[PDB]
């Protein structure tokens, strides 16, 4: 396998490029590591504005290397006040099988790549997800994301435990956006999300009537 040490990557628009670490985790077969970028709609884009190189490289068993993420000049065309969504893909192709009538299975990892304009650079300590707003609506809650970033919500409950367990189809909220998620009513809403580092914190909300905010 070609290890993607984390679950997402943020591209600091202030930088001209950044590296992503990868590695062959199988101890037998050398792999062909394909790396490419897709846009918010998950369509491959090799032109730009975000680039991944090399597009392919050979990785010996248990070896490690990198993939360089860089931007073209047209990156400037993206909004400068909010994040733009991309996806980094790493597919590891194994040597063809000599056998006949075989189903070759290749592994591929797709992780979100957040393009963060220099203008919205965040303090390593900053927690903007506490700006999320929950509004009680028929059938569940209207979650609004007033921040300039994408927010992935993986749990909504009445306690820290219910948020981590309770059935919930994770959903992603685009910058300055909103959408409703079906849910039971909880006196003190607890919402779980995934942050820049893969940490899955839970937020405590206090509701003033039907409008809840983080305490």
């Amino acid at each position: 396998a070609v290890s993607l040490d984390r679950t997402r990557a943020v591209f600091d628009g202030s930088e001209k490029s950044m590296t992503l670490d990868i590695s062959n985790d199988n101890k037998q077969l050398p792999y062909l590591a394909q790396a490419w970028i897709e846009n918010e709609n998950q369509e491959k884009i090799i032109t730009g504005p975000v680039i991944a190189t090399p597009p392919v490289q050979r990785l010996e068993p248990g070896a490690k290397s990198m993939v360089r993420l860089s931007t073209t000049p047209d990156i400037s065309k993206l909004p400068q006040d909010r994040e733009s969504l991309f996806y980094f893909n790493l597919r590891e192709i194994p040597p063809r099988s000599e056998k006949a009538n075989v189903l070759q299975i290749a592994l591929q990892t797709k992780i979100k790549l957040f393009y963060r304009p220099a203008a919205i650079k965040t303090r390593p300590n900053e927690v903007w997800q506490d700006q999320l707003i929950l509004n009680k609506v028929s059938g569940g809650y209207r979650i609004e994301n007033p921040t300039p970033y994408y927010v992935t919500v993986i749990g909504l409950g009445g306690s820290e435990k219910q948020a981590e367990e309770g059935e919930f189809e994770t959903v992603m909220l685009s910058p300055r956006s909103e959408q409703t998620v079906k849910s039971a009513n909880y006196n003190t809403p607890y919402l779980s999300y995934i942050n820049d580092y893969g940490g899955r914190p839970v937020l405590s909300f206090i509701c003033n009537g039907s409008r809840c905010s983080v305490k």
Partner: protein
């Protein structure tokens, strides 16, 4: 070590199934398919209730227009043979591009989560009616995609 959830295990890292089939005795008369070949993908540092919340599992590959939801095969029987992928529930066709159905079939063994998948070769309804499938090799590829939320 605890980091990077539900990553594919080193053991289930190199999966591939080998079908043992004969043209006339398997692809000329109903059912028109080979026996199910089973392959298992084990996800490490992965747990039950967290699966669908952390990662989505999909098989991508070129679809066989004549057999929707099946993989295209290469070689002389291209267009005559399709590869069916069976999800963990052991029955549902895991169509290419669609995600694996959370639940049924999955086995929570240890700190890991094994996914017992199945695959079988099948002839096009027309390739079967006409008995056009010829003795000869065929090959197919599929990509097991881990998409992290």
């Amino acid at each position: 070590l605890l980091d990077r959830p539900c990553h594919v295990s080193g053991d289930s890292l190199n999966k591939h199934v080998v079908f043992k089939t004969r043209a006339s005795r398997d692809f000329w008369y109903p059912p028109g398919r080979s026996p199910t070949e089973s392959f298992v993908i084990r996800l490490e540092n992965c747990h039950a209730t967290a699966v669908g919340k952390i990662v989505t599992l999909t098989f991508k590959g070129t679809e066989e227009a004549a057999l929707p939801g099946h993989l295209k095969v290469t070689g002389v029987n291209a267009g005559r043979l399709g590869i069916a992928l069976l999800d963990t529930d052991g029955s549902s066709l895991l169509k290419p591009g669609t995600s694996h159905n959370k639940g049924q079939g999955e086995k929570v063994t240890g700190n890991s989560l094994e996914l017992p998948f199945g695959a079988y070769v099948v002839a096009t309804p027309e390739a079967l009616r006409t008995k056009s499938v010829v003795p000869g090799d065929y090959e197919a590829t599929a990509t097991f995609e881990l998409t992290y939320r």
